[PDB]
Structure formats: C-alpha cells, structure tokens
Amino acid sequence: GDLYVAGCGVWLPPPVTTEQALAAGHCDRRLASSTRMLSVAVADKETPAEMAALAAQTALDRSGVAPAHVDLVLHASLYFQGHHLWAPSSYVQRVAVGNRCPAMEVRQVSNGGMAALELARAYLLAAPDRVAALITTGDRMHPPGFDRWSSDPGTVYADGGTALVLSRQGGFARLRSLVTVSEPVLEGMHRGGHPFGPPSPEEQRAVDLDAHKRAYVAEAGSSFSVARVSAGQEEALTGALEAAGAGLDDISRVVLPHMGWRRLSAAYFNKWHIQPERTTWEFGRRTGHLGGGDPIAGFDHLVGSGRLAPGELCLLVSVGAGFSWSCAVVELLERPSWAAAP
Amino acid sequence: PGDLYVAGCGVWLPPPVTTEQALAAGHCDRRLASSTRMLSVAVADKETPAEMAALAAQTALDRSGVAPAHVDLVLHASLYFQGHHLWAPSSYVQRVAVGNRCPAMEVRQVSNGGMAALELARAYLLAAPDRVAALITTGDRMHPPGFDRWSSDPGTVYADGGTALVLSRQGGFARLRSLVTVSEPVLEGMHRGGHPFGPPSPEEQRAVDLDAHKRAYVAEAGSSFSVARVSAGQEEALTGALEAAGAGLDDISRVVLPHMGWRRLSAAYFNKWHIQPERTTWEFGRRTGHLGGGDPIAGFDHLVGSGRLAPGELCLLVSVGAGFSWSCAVVELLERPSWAAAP
Ligand SMILES: CC(C)(COP(=O)(O)O)[C@@H](O)C(=O)NCCC(=O)NCCSC1(CC(=O)O)COC1
Ligand SMILES: CC(C)(COP(=O)(O)O)[C@@H](O)C(=O)NCCC(=O)NCCSC1(CC(=O)O)COC1
Numbered sequence: 286g287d288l289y290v291a292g293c294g295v296w297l298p299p300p301v302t303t304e305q306a307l308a309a310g311h312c313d314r315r316l317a318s319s320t321r322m323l324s325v326a327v328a329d330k331e332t333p334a335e336m337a338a339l340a341a342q343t344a345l346d347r348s349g350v351a352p353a354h355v356d357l358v359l360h361a362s363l364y365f366q367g368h369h370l371w372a373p374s375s376y377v378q379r380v381a382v383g384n385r386c387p388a389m390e391v392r393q394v395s396n397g398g399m400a401a402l403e404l405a406r407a408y409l410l411a412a413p414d415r416v417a418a419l420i421t422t423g424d425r426m427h428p429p430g431f432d433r434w435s436s437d438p439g440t441v442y443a444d445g446g447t448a449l450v451l452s453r454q455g456g457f458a459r460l461r462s463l464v465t466v467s468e469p470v471l472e473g474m475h476r477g478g479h480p481f482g483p484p485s486p487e488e489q490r491a492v493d494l495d496a497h498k499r500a501y502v503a504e505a506g507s508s509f510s511v512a513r514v515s516a517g518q519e520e521a522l523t524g525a526l527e528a529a530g531a532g533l534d535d536i537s538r539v540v541l542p543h544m545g546w547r548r549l550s551a552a553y554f555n556k557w558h559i560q561p562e563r564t565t566w567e568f569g570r571r572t573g574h575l576g577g578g579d580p581i582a583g584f585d586h587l588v589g590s591g592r593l594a595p596g597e598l599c600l601l602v603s604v605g606a607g608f609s610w611s612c613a614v615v616e617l618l619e620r621p622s623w624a625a626a627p
Numbered sequence: 628p629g630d631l632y633v634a635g636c637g638v639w640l641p642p643p644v645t646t647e648q649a650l651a652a653g654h655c656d657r658r659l660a661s662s663t664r665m666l667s668v669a670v671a672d673k674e675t676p677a678e679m680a681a682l683a684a685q686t687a688l689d690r691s692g693v694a695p696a697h698v699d700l701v702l703h704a705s706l707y708f709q710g711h712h713l714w715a716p717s718s719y720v721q722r723v724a725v726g727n728r729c730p731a732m733e734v735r736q737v738s739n740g741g742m743a744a745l746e747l748a749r750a751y752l753l754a755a756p757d758r759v760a761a762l763i764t765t766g767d768r769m770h771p772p773g774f775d776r777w778s779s780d781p782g783t784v785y786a787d788g789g790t791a792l793v794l795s796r797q798g799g800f801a802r803l804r805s806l807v808t809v810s811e812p813v814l815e816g817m818h819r820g821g822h823p824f825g826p827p828s829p830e831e832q833r834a835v836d837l838d839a840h841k842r843a844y845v846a847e848a849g850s851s852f853s854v855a856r857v858s859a860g861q862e863e864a865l866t867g868a869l870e871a872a873g874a875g876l877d878d879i880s881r882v883v884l885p886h887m888g889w890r891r892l893s894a895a896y897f898n899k900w901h902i903q904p905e906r907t908t909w910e911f912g913r914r915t916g917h918l919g920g921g922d923p924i925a926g927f928d929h930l931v932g933s934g935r936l937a938p939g940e941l942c943l944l945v946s947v948g949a950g951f952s953w954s955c956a957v958v959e960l961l962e963r964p965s966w967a968a969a970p
Contacts, residue, residue, distance in 0.1 A: 369706075404751065472715060475711065
C-alpha cells in the first residue's frame with residue numbers, strides 16, 4: 286500500500302536573465318520589480334516531448350527500475366505539444382522507456398503533474414502486481430502563440446521537462462499524502478465567452494489571460510472570486526497535512542509554484558506566515574514556471590542539492606486554472622546516490 | 628465484487644452535412660466519396676468541444692440516475708484544440724453537467740482517448756473501497772483553419788460532437804466484462820514530422836497533413852514492418868479482450884468499430900476477421916463521421932438506444948489511435964434501459 290518516489294529528474298534549457306529580457310523589450314521594469322524574477326529557462330530547438338523524454342531518462346536511470354516494471358506512462362502538459370493528432374506520450378515511451386505499457390496524456394493546466402500523480406497512484410493500487418509508473422511534463426512557450434512574460438502577468442513561463450518515477454516496491458522518499466481539490470465554478474476565469482455560459486468560439490492567437498480574469502471578476506464579484514480561490518487552497522493544504530498526520534510546523538521545506546513574488550506573497554508568504562527561505566523561492570525565481578511540472582522540479586532540486594534531510598517532511602503545493610489544487614506531503618527516507626550531501 | 632457497469636451514456640451531435648453537399652462545395656471528390664462510402668458527417672457551427680461534451684454528459688448522467696455526490700472522477704478526452712489555452716475544459720464539463728467537486732481532468736490518447744480514460748477511470752474506482760461512479764466525456768470540433776475534416780487524414784472523415792459515459796461500481800444496465808489496452812510506441816513517428824526515429828520537427832504551423840507523415844514513415848521503416856506491426860497490435864487487443872471475457876468472436880452479437888471510411892474498415896476488419904458489416908455500427912458511423920476518441924461510446928449508445936442489442940448479448944468495442952494504442956472491451960447487456968427503443 287505504501288507509495289514511494291524512486292526517481293526524479295529535469296531537463297532545463299539554458300536561462301535567459303531578466304536583464305537580457307529587459308534589454309530585448311520582452312519585459313518591462315515594473316514586471317521585473319513586481320515578480321522579482323532573475324531568469325527563466327528558454328529552449329532553442331527542443332520541443333516538449335523531447336524535453337520530457339530527456340527528463341524521463343534521468344529519472345528512470347536514477348530509479349534503477351527495469352522497463353518491464355514501468356506499468357504506466359503519463360505525460361502532462363498545458364500548451365501545444367507540436368503536432369496535432371500525434372501521441373507525445375508514445376514518443377516519451379519509445380525514447381525513454383522502450384516498453385509496452387499504456388502511455389497517455391493527462392492535463393489539468395498548471396496542476397497537470399499532480400493530476401497525473403493522482404491517476405498514477407490509483408493505477409498502481411488497482412492491481413496487486415503493478416510496480417512503478419512514469420510521470421513526465423514538458424512545454425515550450427514560444428513567441429508566436431504565447432508571450433512568456435505577459436500572456437499571464439505575474440508568472441513567467443519556462444520551457445523544459447520534468448519526470449518522476451512512482452513505485453510500490455520502494456524508493457528514497459515515501460508519499461505520505463496527496464489530496465486534490467476542485468472548484469469548477471472558477472472555470473470561466475481563464476476563457477472567453479460568458480463566465481457562466483458556454484465558451485466563445487474563437488481564440489488561439491496569443492493567450493491573454495488578463496482580459497478573461499477581469500471579465501470574470503466583473504461578473505462574479507471580486508469578493509466571491511478571492512474567497513473561493515482562498516478556500517480551495519486552504520482545503521488542499523489542511524487536507525494533505527491532516528491525511529499525513531502533520532501540521533505545517535512539521536514541514537521542513539515547502540515546494541511552491543514558480544510564480545512571481547507578488548503572487549507568492551499574497552497566496553502563501555503573507556497568508557501562511559512562512560519565510561521564503563523555507564521554500565523553493567530562490568530556485569523557482571531563476572527557473573520560471575515549468576507548466577505543470579514545478580512540484581517535480583522543486584522536489585528534485587531540494588533533494589539533489591541536499592537541502593532536504595532524511596526524516597524531514599516536504600510539502601508540495603500546486604494549483605491550476607479550473608481551479609484545481611493539489612498538496613502532497615513527502616517524507617525523505619534517505620539521500621539518493623545522485624544527491625549532494627550538505 | 629470488483630465488477631464495473633455502464634450506468635448511462637449519451638451523445639450530442641450537431642446537424643449533418645451530406646456527402647452530396649460536400650461534393651458540391653469541393654470538400655470531397657468522387658474518388659474519396661466512393662472509397663469511404665460516407666453518407667454524412669456531424670458538423671458544428673458555434674458549439675465548442677467542451678460545450679458538446681457537457682451536453683452529452685447531461686444526457687448520460689440523467690439516464691444513469693447517479694447523484695452528483697457519487698460521481699467521483701471526471702475525465703474529458705479529446706484529440707484536437709479545445710478552444711482556449713491555459714483553460715480547463717474538464718472543469719467546464721464538471722461545472723455545467725455535474726455540479727460537484729471531485730477531481731476533473733483531461734486524458735488524451737489520439738483517436739483512442741475515450742478508452743484510455745475508461746482505463747484510468749476503472750483503476751480510480753477500484754483503488755479505494757468507497758468510490759462509486761466516474762464520468763467520461765469526449766468532445767472535438769475539427770474546423771477549417773487548422774484541420775480539413777475530409778483530407779487531413781484521407782480515408783477517415785472527422786466529425787464534430789460530444790459523447791459521454793457513466794461508469795459505476797454499484798450497478799448499471801450493462802456489465803464491463805473485459806477491457807485491454809495495447810501499446811506500440813515504435814509507430815509514434817508515423818503521425819508527425821521530423822524523423823520517425825529522431826526528435827520531432829519544430830512546431831507544425833499549417834493544416835494537419837497526416838498523409839505526408841505516413842509516407843515518410845513507411846519510406847524510412849518499410850511497408851512490410853509498418854503493416855505487420857499495426858496488424859499485430861490490433862490482433863493483440865482483440866484476442867486479449869475476448870480471452871479476458873471468456874468469449875470468442877463467435878459469441879459477440881455486435882461489433883462497435885471506429886467510424887472510418889469503408890476502405891479502411893474493409894482492410895482492418897471486414898476482410899480480416901470475416902465479420903459482416905451488418906453486425907457492426909457501419910451504417911451509424913458512415914452518417915456520423917469520426918468523433919475523435921468518442922466512437923466506441925457513440926456506437927455503443929446507438930446500439931443500445933436503438934434496441935439492436937438484447938439482454939444477455941455481448942458487444943465488442945474496438946478502438947485505435949495514433950501512437951499506436953489499441954483498446955478492446957467486451958460489454959454484456961444486462962437489461963434494456965428505459966430510454967432505449969424496443970426492437
Ligand atoms: C490565493 C489568493 C492569493 C489569496 O488571496 P488573499 O490574500 O486576498 O486572501 C487568492 O485570493 C488569489 O487571488 N490568487 C491569485 C488568483 C487569481 O485571482 N487570479 C489569477 C489566477 S492564475 C493561476 C495560474 C498559475 O498557476 O500561475 C491559476 O491559479 C494561479
Ligand atoms: C490497419 C491495417 C490494415 C491492418 O493490417 P492488415 O492490412 O494486414 O490488416 C494495416 O495494414 C495498415 O494499414 N497500416 C497503415 C497505417 C494507417 O493508415 N494508420 C491510420 C492512421 S490514423 C488512425 C486513427 C483513426 O483514423 O481512427 C490511427 O489508426 C488509424
């Protein structure tokens with residue numbers, strides 16, 4: 286019944302600094318100041334499945350899991366994967382695993398990685414003989430259909446891949462809890478059309494979330510909008526902590542989404558009263574938002590850098606547009622052979 | 628004790644466009660009309676994919692009688708653009724059709740997406756002792772800018788519409804006797820640019836053109852290899868599902884096939900398995916078109932609602948998508964639901 290993290294890894298393209306973004310007029314100084322971002326991973330020619338596959342190779346090698354024991358492949362993403370009517374999950378399988386288990390996509394906007402983890406956990410527990418599952422994420426947020434800095438002001442989107450190997454047999458960390466909360470009444474906040482009617486039939490030029498958020502608040506009211514988002518976040522946090530038998534004071538590290546400083550302050554630092562030094566803030570602000578993969582990149586970072594110690598608890602915090610929230614408590618059991626000692 | 632049932636199902640299909648009208652507009656030529664033998668395809672005007680999925684889910688949930696509190700998962704499958712980036716179509720389906728707060732997400736596996744979500748839904752319900760039902764939906768809209776319903780993938784004509792199915796552990800009008808999924812990722816490169824066995828090419832900025840990528844894959848990997856590997860996956864899914872249900876093909880009363888053109892179905896199924904078109908959903912699919920990954924649901928819903936399937940009879944669901952992935956399922960009709968015609 287127990288579930289473990291057997292391996293994890295990332296593939297991040299080289300960073301583009303905020304200074305170089307300012308120089309190119311991709312970012313203004315107000316956004317630079319409000320987000321306090323330092324750099325964002327930006328890919329040149331690598332596409333999403335390629336980057337996911339590269340992360341899966343690292344995660345699988347670190348795990349020591351045989352390909353015959355990978356019983357599910359789930360690839361999560363939030364933006365165009367490059368080729369319509371093509372199966373990026375099958376590319377990840379062919380290149381990174383080389384086996385024949387089911388391989389498919391799971392999507393839940395910036396929460397896709399945790400959504401895939403929920404489905405992976407269920408899949409592994411539904412049959413007594415299953416062993417491990419591979420979860421990957423990958424996205425590429427290029428200039429013609431997406432604006433990395435202002436398509437969704439307050440969050441700077443990154444290119445890159447992440448991967449995690451979940452196992453029933455064992456691993457270096459134990460999953461103590463995972464909870465997902467859904468508040469679909471917020472659905473219309475990220476689309477055109479009436480917030481409570483059907484979606485408008487036209488849009489794919491350049492994502493402009495800011496326009497839709499204001500239209501949603503106008504129709505639903507700021508009071509309602511702020512409250513429901515707050516309530517969803519609180520349900521996921523307290524649900525995960527209660528399921529793990531922990532309180533926030535038992536948590537050593539908090540893996541937060543890689544959003545800008547203003548957003549993280551309002552949602553987490555000034556609400557929960559935690560210090561940034563207890564989170565992945567410094568990592569995320571040089572990385573950027575990796576679509577649905579931030580919890581994986583952040584946990585991988587904490588472990589690989591030795592910032593998390595055996596016996597310590599880690600809290601994964603993730604959120605997506607629907608809205609959907611996931612929180613997980615992960616217990617580090619031992620330092621993996623790939624990790625730096627402090 | 629582990630058993631799973633179909634409690635409800637439904638579709639929402641926009642008005643049809645006939646092959647004659649397609650011929651007249653120069654969307655279809657006589658050789659394509661003749662090779663596919665399509666009669667019409669469902670075409671949406673202003674309805675978006677999640678809108679159509681939500682309408683189908685309303686019908687399916689109303690038919691099932693399952694309360695929203697017993698819907699413990701919502702999975703929305705699709706194969707083409709859902710209309711809005713960084714937006715959650717699965718949350719729209721939840722808000723409009725369910726009104727609850729269980730997890731809602733997307734599952735995708737090309738033209739096999741509906742059966743893929745069925746696999747994950749089944750695991751989810753079986754992974755915890757108190758779960759009851761799950762809602763599965765599909766929805767797509769294949770419009771002219773980036774897609775040509777008649778020639779983006781010649782030999783299959785793609786439809787607009789939504790489908791929905793309610794899976795339950797408590798009961799239903801049909802029992803899921805078996806469900807198996809087969810994966811051959813070596814065929815992955817057949818549906819993209821680049822190099823079949825290298826990384827994908829940079830972002831596809833044009834109308835979908837699968838014929839180009841299939842020719843490039845066959846040139847590189849060989850026709851003998853491609854045809855054999857595709858044939859082997861289809862045969863594995865078929866015999867796996869039938870063996871898992873304790874049935875042989877002669878025990879199947881009706882086959883729900885994908886809504887491809889006549890030439891593809893003949894080569895894959897009619898001439899291979901020696902089954903009659905009259906035992907399949909051929910007549911239904913040829914007036915509907917390919918509903919992305921919802922065909923098994925639409926075809927099963929058609930068979931049940933029209934009374935062509937009788938209590939005690941077994942039904943075989945057949946699905947395939949690029950990747951490749953294949954799913955087959957055997958479903959036993961337990962009773963005629965009250966919304967179904969008597970034959
Ligand atoms: C949670 C709290 C911050 C609490 O606020 P108080 O301090 O006012 O109680 C809340 O009231 C709030 O507004 N949060 C920001 C959400 C919003 O309204 N619009 C943007 C939503 S974009 C997003 C995409 C991403 O992942 O980057 C999807 O979720 C993030
Ligand atoms: C299938 C078979 C005929 C079986 O082998 P036998 O010919 O010996 O029977 C085989 O010979 C064959 O043709 N291989 C060529 C590949 C091909 O065209 N794939 C379609 C690509 S889009 C598609 C989705 C859909 O439309 O639903 C994914 O599957 C259809």
